[PDB]
Structure formats: C-alpha cells, structure tokens
Amino acid sequence: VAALFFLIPLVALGFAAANFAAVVRKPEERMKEISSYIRSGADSFLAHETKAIFKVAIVIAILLMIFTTWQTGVAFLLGAVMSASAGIVGMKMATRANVRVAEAARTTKIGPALKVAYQGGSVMGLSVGGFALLGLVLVYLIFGKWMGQVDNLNIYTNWLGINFVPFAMTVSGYALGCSIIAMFDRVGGGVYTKAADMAADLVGKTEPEDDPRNPATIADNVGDNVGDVAGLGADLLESFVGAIVSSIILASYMFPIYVQKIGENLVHQVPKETIQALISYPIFFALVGLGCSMLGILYVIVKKPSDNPQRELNISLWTSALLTVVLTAFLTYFYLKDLQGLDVLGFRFGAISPWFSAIIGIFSGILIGFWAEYYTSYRYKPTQFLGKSSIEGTGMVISNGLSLGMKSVFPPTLTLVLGILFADYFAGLYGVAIAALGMLSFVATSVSVDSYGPIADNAGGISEMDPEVRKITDHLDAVGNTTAAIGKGFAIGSAIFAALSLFASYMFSQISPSDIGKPPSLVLLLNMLDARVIAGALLGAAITYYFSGYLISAVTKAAMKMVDEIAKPDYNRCIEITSDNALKQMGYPAFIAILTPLVTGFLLGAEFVGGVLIGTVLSGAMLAILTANSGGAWDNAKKYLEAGNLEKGSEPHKALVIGDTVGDPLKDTVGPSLDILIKIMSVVSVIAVSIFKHVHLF
Amino acid sequence: YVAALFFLIPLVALGFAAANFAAVVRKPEGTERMKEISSYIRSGADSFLAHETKAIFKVAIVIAILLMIFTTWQTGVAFLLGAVMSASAGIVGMKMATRANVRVAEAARTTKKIGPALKVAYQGGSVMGLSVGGFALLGLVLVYLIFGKWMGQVDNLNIYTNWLGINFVPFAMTVSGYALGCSIIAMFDRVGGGVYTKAADMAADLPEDDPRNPATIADNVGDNVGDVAGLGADLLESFVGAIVSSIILASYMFPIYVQKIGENLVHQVPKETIQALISYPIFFALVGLGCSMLGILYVIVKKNPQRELNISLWTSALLTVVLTAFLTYFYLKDLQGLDVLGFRFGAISPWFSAIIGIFSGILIGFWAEYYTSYRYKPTQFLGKSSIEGTGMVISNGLSLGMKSVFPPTLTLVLGILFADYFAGLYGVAIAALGMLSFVATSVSVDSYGPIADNAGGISEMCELDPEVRKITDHLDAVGNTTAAIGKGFAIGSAIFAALSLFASYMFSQISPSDIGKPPSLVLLLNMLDARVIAGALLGAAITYYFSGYLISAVTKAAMKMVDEIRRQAYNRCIEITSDNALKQMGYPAFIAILTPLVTGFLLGAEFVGGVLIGTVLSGAMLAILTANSGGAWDNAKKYLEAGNLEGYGKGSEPHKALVIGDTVGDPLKDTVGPSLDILIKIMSVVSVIAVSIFKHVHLF
C-alpha cells in the first residue's frame, strides 16, 4: 500500500502536466502577441533567477557536505530542484494560459472560461504539492530506508566531530533547499514586482496612470505572476515542507532524548519502532492531503460550472480540507494504534491524538483566512470606514490604514494562540507541528486557488489592452484579487506555524550525547531569564524590523532604476535590468536571514540564537500581518471609491491612490518576505546549532 | 548617621524646585498683550489638570482598596504615597512651565540676548526635573524607612503569608505597590495627555498656527502637557522601576539561596547582605540626584544653548559615575555572598553596570538624534525624496523608522549582555538605575523644550519684532531636537526598566515550596512551553492593537474638537477634548491593567511571563519606529522650510508631501510611542504583583 501512496506524487505530477497540455490545446491574432510578449519576459526573469539560485545552491551544497554529512547536501539539491521545477512549470503554464481564458470567456460568454483558468492554476498547485512530496519521499527511501538512516536513529558524529541524528540532518537539508529557492523567488520577485508597479504607475505620471503600451505594465503583469503564482507557491511549499521536517526532527530527536540509563546499559524509553512510525506519519498525512485535494479539484473542474466563481473554489477548499480530515482520521487511528510509549511524548489520545492537532490547525488556517478577508475587503466594516474617511484627508487615510493593520494584528494572533494551545494539549510539540501540517494538508489546493488569482488579473489586463469580455475579465480579476488576499493571509498563518515548529526542532536538535543522562526537562530548555536569550530576542526583533524596512527602499530603488531606463515596438525587455538589480538588491537581506544565526551563534552560542529565533518569529508575524492587511485594505478601498459604490479622479481618490502606492510594496514585498525570514532563519539555525552549540567564541 | 545626608536629597530637590519657581515668578512678564494669551493657556492647562486629577484619583482609590484587600495594607499606603509623589511632581512642573514662557520672551527683549532668557527657561525646566527626582527619591526613602526598618520588613526578609493565603516577601510587595502607583499616574498623564495633545494638534491644522484658533490655545497647552508632564513622568517611572527591580531582586535572592546542608536550613546569602543590597540602589539614586542638582547649579550660575545643556547632562552623569564609584567600593566592600549573586568583580562589580547604563543612555540618545534630525543623512534623504512624490515620502519615513530600530537596540543588547557578565540580573537593574540616575537633568531639558516652543508661540502671539522673533525662534528648534533625544532616552530606559521588572517578576514567582527547589529550577521561563509561546504572540498582538487604538482615539478626539469649534462663533473646547480623551483611555488602560490578570487566572504564570516578554519586544520595536519616524518627518519638513532644499520653498508640492507625512507622524511619535513605553512597564508591574495570587490559581 505504501507503494500506492508513493504513487500519489507521480500521479499529481502527471495530472498537472496533462492539465498544462490541455490548456496548450485551449485556443488563444492581435491578442496572442501580447501573451507571447509576457511569456518571453517571464522566461528571461526565470532564467536570470535560476542561474543565480543554482550558483548559490552549489555553494550551499558544498558547504553542507564539507561541514556535515554529504547526504544532506544531496537532499538539498533534490529539494531545490523540486521547487524550481514546480515554479517554472506553473509560470510557463500561466504565461500561455493568460489569453486562453480570455478566448474562453468570449467563446463561452463567464461560466466555461473559468474552468480554463482553474485548470491552469491547478497546474501550479499540483506541481508544488507533487514536487515537494516527491523530494520528501525520495529522501525517506533512498536515504531513509535504502541507506538505513532510520535503522540507526542514534547520534552520528561527523568526521570533524559534529553530532546529530542523521535523518534529521538530511530532512533539514531538504527544507533548507526549499527555503533557499523560496527566498530567492519571493524576495527578489517581490522587489521586482513592486519596482515594476511603482515604475509603471510613476511612468504613467512621468510623461495617463497605467498606460497599456508602458513596458513596465507588461512587467507588472509578469510580476503578478512571479509573486502570487511562483513566489506564493514556493512560500507555501516551504511552509509545508518545514512543518513536515519539524515533525520528523522532533520524532528523531525524541528517540535519543527519551532514554534511561538505570545501569551501564541504556534503555530507550521510546522504542526505535515508535520513533520510526512518528518519523513516517507526517509524510503519509501530506500524501493523504494531496489525494483529497486532487479529488476535490477533479470534481470542481468536471462538474457544471456555476456563475459564482468564488463559491466553486471555496467548495474545493472545503472538500479537500474536510475529506483529508475524515480520511487521515482512519490513517491517524490505525497507523499510531500499535505504537508504545505515546504517553511520554504527550499524546492525550494514543493513536488519534495528532489527528485532532491536525484538524484544529486546518480550522485555524480557515479562520485566519476569514479574518484577513474581514479586515481587508470592502464588503466589511473596517475597509468601509477607511474608504468613507478618504474624504477626511490624505494623512487621515494613511493613519487609518496603519491603525487598521495594527488592530487587525490581534484576531489572527488569537486564532493561532488557541490553535497552538489545543494542539499542545493534544500531542505536545509534535502535535503542534502536526497541526501546522494539517493547516497545510491541502497545500496543493491552496496553491492552485492562489495561482488562479494572477491569471484572472492578467485576463482583466488583457481586456484593458470586447465590452462584455472586458467587464467579465474585470470581474474575474476582482475575484482573483480577493482570493489572493485570502491566500496571503493563509500563507502568513502557516508560516508562523512552520517557524514555531522549526524553533521547536531547533531546541530538539540541540540535544547532545552528554545530555543523554539528563532528564527531558534539562535538554529541552530555552530559559527566558538568561540575559543572553533576552539580548538575542531583542536583536532578532530589530533585525526583522530592519529587513522589512530595507525591502521598502529596495523596491523604490529598483523602480527608480526602471524609471531611469525609458517596427515601432521592436523588442523592449527592461525587466532584466530591474530583475538583475533586484537579484543584487535582495543579496543583502538574504545575507541577513542566512547569516544571522551563524555569527551570533559562533560569537555567543546556541542559547542566544534561540532568543534571536523567537524574537524574529514574533516580530515577523506581527509586521507581516500589519503590512499585508494595510496594503490590501488600501487597494480595495480604492476599488470601492472607483466604483463609487458609496461615497473618480477626485481629492479623496488622490489620497487613496497615494496610500495604495505606499501599500503595494508593503503588502506584496515586505510582508511576504518576513515569513520567509522567520522560517529560513529557523531552518538555518536548526542546522548550524550542531556546530555552534558548543563552538561559541564568547 | 551618614545615610541621613542622603535621606535629605529628595527634600533638597523639592525645596530647590520651589525656590526656582519663586525666583522665576519674581521675573517680569513684560508686554500685557502676550501675557493675556499666556493666562489663557494657564487656565486651559489648569482645567485639564483638574479633570485628569479627579479621574486618576478615583481610579487610584479603587486600586488601593483592592490592593489593601488582597495584600498587606503597607502596600496600599506605599501605592498612594507614590501616586501622590508623581502627581505633585507633574502639577508643579506644569504650573512652572505654563507660567515660565513669558519670562523667557520678555527676558530676550529686556536683555537683547538669548543667554539671560535661557537662564529663565532652564530654571523653569529644572522645576519639573527636580520635582520628578525629589518626589521619587522621597517616596522611596520613606518606604525604605517607615516600612523597611520600623516594622522590620527588611529585618525579617522572609516569606509572609497574607490572610487570604498569598505568600510573598513583604518589602518587595511594598515597593511593587509604590511602582504601581507611579505607573497609574504615568499612564493617566501619558496616555490621556497624548491623546489630548495630538487631538489638539490635529484640531489646530484641521505660517505656523491659525489665527486665534481655540485649538491654537489647546495646542499651546498640549505642548506643555506632553514633554513637561508626560515625558517627565515617564522618566520618573522608569527610574523608580529600576530601583524597585533592584530591591525586589535582593529581597527574593535572600530566600531563594537556601541549603539544608549543615543539618539545618542555612541561608546562603546572609540577611545583612540582602539588606545592604536592598539599600544600595536607593543610595545610588540619591547620589545621582545630588550630582544632577550640582550640575544644574553649575549650569545656572554662569551667564550656543545646546552645548550648555549637553554640558549639564555630562556633568551630572560623570559626577554620578565618579561618586557612585566610591559609593560602590565602600558600601559593598564588606558584603558577603556576592559570588552567589553573580558578581565577577566583588564590591565594585555592580558599579560598572551603573556606568554601563549611563554611557548607554547617552549613546541611545545620540542614536535617536542621528535618525531623527535633518543635520544628518537620513532626514536629508527624506527631504530630498519630497521631490519624487508624497507616497515616496511616506514609504521612506516608514522605512527609516524600521531601519532606525536597529542601532539603539544593538546598544541595549550589548549593554544588557555586559551588565549580566558583570553582576547578573541585579546588575542589569543597577544599570537601569544608573542610566536613569540623572533623571532630573533629563526631565529638566525635556521640560525646557516646549517652554521654548510655546514661548516662541508667545513671541509670535500678538505681533513682535522680527529680530526679537528670531532669538526666541532659535530657542524652540533647540528644544525640538533635545525633545527628540529625550524621547529616545525615555524609550530606551523604559525598555531596560521593563526588562528589569520581568526579572523581578520571575523572582516574585518564588513560592515557599519552591524554596527547597534548586536556584536554576525556580528562576525559569522555558520558551518551548506552548503556553509561553501563545502568551508571547498574544502580548505582541495586544501591543499592536493598543497602538492602533491610540491612533483612532487621537483622530476621534480631534474630530470632536472640530465639531465643537463649529458650534463656537475659551476653555470649553479643552474640556470637551479632556472628557473624550479620558473615556478613550479607559479601554487601552483596561487592556494594559487586566491583561495580566485575565491571562494569568485563565492560563497561568508561564503564559503571563510569555505575554510580558512578547509585549516588551513588540512595544520596544513599535515605540522606536513610531517616535523616530515622526521626529524625522518633522525635521525633514523643517529642512524644506529652512531652505536647505533649493528650488522648493514653503507651500510647494514637495513641502506638501512632507507636511502630510508629518501629520501622519505626529500622532505616532507623540502618542503611540510614549504610550507603548507606559504599556510595557505597567504590564510588567501588574504581572509582578498579581503573580503572587494567580501563580497557582489559574483556572484553565
């Protein structure tokens, strides 16, 4: 049967490739040229990024093999290739799918055209899911079972003298690869995306607002795809992989931590069989999630498309989530029934214990999404207050947006607090990680619905460059914008969950062979009364704020570089100038996110790094929530004024447009980069704590 | 004996502040037309003060009743004592400031020079500074004497069990009540006064001020309300909190270090050493107040203003350094058990911590300056970005604040690390005390600031000579820069004091059953506990929500004043704002006060510790960001107005972008930041107190 679960990744990959081929079959003369224009620009950006990322990955794998065991470097390469493949597939799928849906809208008059766009987005969603789970299964087989990485499950010592559970180190390397690709995609692509929006909206004003023949306008469509299709997909992939890797690390290290030396011999209080089963269970959970998501997507694409698009995708999400719930019910119920010693791990239900954590994480993600919706949409009270206040002043608009974000911080944080508390009550930290996984159990469906958004935005833009077709694409673009906001909120929540699980794995990875005799209370400890920890937390929070602030100036500078530049059309592909600049400009923030654990870890030690991690996680969650919600609220409040639904080209509209020019880079670059900051720093620290746990120079 | 010459320092400061008040009152006011407007501001400020005092004393009565019911009466008495001390300091400073602007302006005209008028302005600010210092040290010395020695609360130093059954060391509980009173008065002053101040600023603008706008008078009153009363009370609170943290740490380190070795319970740290450590921070603060008075005396005697005030600060600070040197070397030379407390250098060890705080505060101050003034690169870049667009100005301001967080935070981190290395958590608290040792001088310069601002408004009131206006106008800009530095110093010291208070919270978490437990096990807040992590997330969310509510409250109060001004066709508009502001402060204050209680009784003490740490982190970061962003926006607007930018003058499009960004920055820098400082510190105090009751009483 496990051979029939291993088949789910290949099934998903083949089904996504088939969806790609079928949309290639979908029909697209003047309109087709622009789609070719955008596809070529996206391919140039992807090539530049891929070259840079693979050079960096070569260096990363070399360092990993030199300073740790080599299998971790090999797994890093595997995961990086998986993520790059998913991103490239989705973007290539979409660049040629943007116009196809428009041709579907005219030929099908609304209704059938949406089926094409969703079959497109499903390509990227299933690609993310299948590639991630494929990399993980290959790591568990080739390294886990083939090489006997689960057979040992004892502290292996590197040739230089580094101690670690080998399979935990390998899964950590895989998570690191995913994190590197996700960081490059989102940080660099977001810098480029908001530089393109800023350059387009400024060039319209430079010499008309969003001109169609503006090169930066084409770049902006490309950036929407780079951000919410490729970048967001990679971010969700990273969070999901991180949750799974945290679960696996926790199990592997609960193997050595729960031992008792009554005499010379050492008796494992948790048998190796239990540790193996706990290492394997999250993978089975993710595979079940992928299966349920594919079933839901199949029912959605096949059945008679209703007029209301949002209800269809919402029902797809509900199907995936609740089906995964009910099925992993049995998986959790039987798989963990035979394990021995689960009361020591903290399981309040034995076999089904973690399933509760998973489901509560699912509902947590759902609720946080709903919260983001409530605070960022014109259909609810807060955005309406901002839109109506637009008459009061421009400074009033900015202050009200900042206050709205600050207030919105609370509800989702309370949701996450309750989810964490109940997941802990159920199954300890392993269950907290399992709850994060459950939240991201249907990561494939989430990524697909998120990719849908940019395609709809591109369809509306295509209408802007038939009256019924233009209006229908505009409505599709608005629904896509709402879905993208919901996706950003869900991604932030899952990122907080993954970063917390990775901090837990970091504390668990800090186990040492000398601590074997010590009780569990001594090893799994990061005291907050130690001055080193407090200083580390302050430093991590300040670094998170510094990263978020730097992203704003980077977007502005890249946009200014695009402004400096610029057969009547001939060939204009300025994107590289911005993209290359973005790839250079994102260099410094990345150096922070990766190198902060090492220096402070080698300067002060592992306890200081834990404080840096917790402070960074907290500050990043808060700042990301604030920035994302502020940007989304400014955008849709401006949309409300555009329709004039209540309360165009006026003074209030000027205040709103300035607030949106500020919010775009904040919600589409800073926010989306902060979660990556927290999670990748957690991963890098989890890995390097093996080296600077005892190697601290002060 | 000899301590009786330190016991006199608070009364000395109080008498000297009264003497400064009398000597300034002797000074003439000059022209009558300006004096009339000054009288109007005095009446408005007094009405606001009366409303505030009535509300705050009602709330303090309720608080003291509950405290005495659930704890020892000595704690309620000390709470009322501290509240009265802070209220007296605030009222005295406010009267001095409201009545001191006209003296400086008329002195500028009479002596045709800035020097002589500045002597009056500094004698004014010194009233508030010395009032803060003297009242604080007086309350603390009275608590150390009447309760500490007379009843033997420093004699016993053992766990007393209340009638309801709550356990605690008595003197720690008493000092905590004192800190609670100070915190309540500071919350009222800063939260309410900031809401009103920025509502009046928003009403004023909703070439500097409108003609006879009622909000013009309101804004003149609010400038005094903020940097004289509010900022002074905040610095006083941080300084008192550092001292109380040191004292609590000593009181609880007495019982925590016990060993049943030797065939009987042996206190590892002798009671004499614990007594000396309880007394040392008080004497250090008294020495600091003395040095501050000496420095201010040297400054006022002799006939560029900033260099003079900077020299006052340096004199006070370095004199405290060199004097607490011998204080530390002799007082603690005979102490026993410092190796258990963590002193790696014995007697003078903690003295280093003190200086490490002092030099850190200075550095942190300078850091604020660097990021918030147009005389340095960041504000210049913002002013130049004024040309590209308004949204660019807003984005660049936000980015500047987010980046500015780092330098001062790194300073604080290194200071904390070195203070720990020197003398443990006790030394961290001692360093907070040293940083705020010259609180009188800091508060004095901070009060000087708006004395100068409204005096410049006073000079521009009526009409006045352009040459005369320039001399008074120059005083106002120096005040603005110094006030930005003071806000930075206050935020940094508040973070440091709140950290010391969290350490005191963990030490207060000691229980008689935990007496047998090892020292490492009792003083522990694991960050891997899900309760703790959830508490941190909740605290950060609460901090952000608090800041957002403060923004909305400022806007609502400004709208109320605008609507009342529409009705007009005196002091009625000020009262309306005061009422609205006090009602608005009900909700955030209730958050800050009841969050520890609810979270502790629902979940427990570890969740409360997590809430505290998360709130401290988020509040420090948000306060730094808001204060620096607002100040930098203001100075960049000045850069464009000053003509440093060429081609663009007042009323230009770049200036429009800069002024809009400044209207956004104002409420953030004058309300959100200072109220965040108050929030973090008061939540630390409330948790430190209530952990005695909900340590084991958590219902979920």
Ligand SMILES: CCCCCCCCCCCCO[C@@H]1O[C@H](CO)[C@@H](O[C@H]2O[C@H](CO)[C@@H](O)[C@H](O)[C@H]2O)[C@H](O)[C@H]1O
């Ligand atoms: C179910 C998967 C089986 C393979 C089918 C894959 C086709 C669907 C993916 C389309 C997107 C990529 O576009 C595809 O890229 C790869 C090269 O990189 C090339 O495709 C070829 O190489 C790949 C990899 O060696 C093989 O799967 C296959 O022999 C062939 O499809 C083609 O140039 C192009 O069809």
Ligand SMILES: CCCCCCCCCCCCO[C@@H]1O[C@H](CO)[C@@H](O[C@H]2O[C@H](CO)[C@@H](O)[C@H](O)[C@H]2O)[C@H](O)[C@H]1O
């Ligand atoms: C067992 C027999 C089969 C063994 C086959 C192994 C072959 C491995 C050598 C592959 C060499 C090609 O290496 C290629 O590099 C470029 C990046 O520069 C990537 O190529 C990918 O991105 C680039 C830039 O967008 C585009 O050409 C294209 O979209 C895509 O093919 C792929 O990573 C890889 O296809």
Ligand SMILES: [Ca+2]
């Ligand atoms: Ca927008």
Ligand SMILES: [Ca+2]
């Ligand atoms: Ca100002």
Ligand SMILES: [Mg+2]
């Ligand atoms: Mg836009």
Ligand SMILES: [Mg+2]
């Ligand atoms: Mg547009």
Ligand SMILES: [Mg+2]
């Ligand atoms: Mg977009």
Ligand SMILES: [Mg+2]
């Ligand atoms: Mg668009």
Ligand SMILES: [Mg+2]
């Ligand atoms: Mg567009």
Ligand SMILES: [Mg+2]
């Ligand atoms: Mg103003």
Ligand SMILES: [Mg+2]
């Ligand atoms: Mg003004």
Ligand SMILES: [Mg+2]
């Ligand atoms: Mg004013």
Ligand SMILES: [Mg+2]
């Ligand atoms: Mg003012």
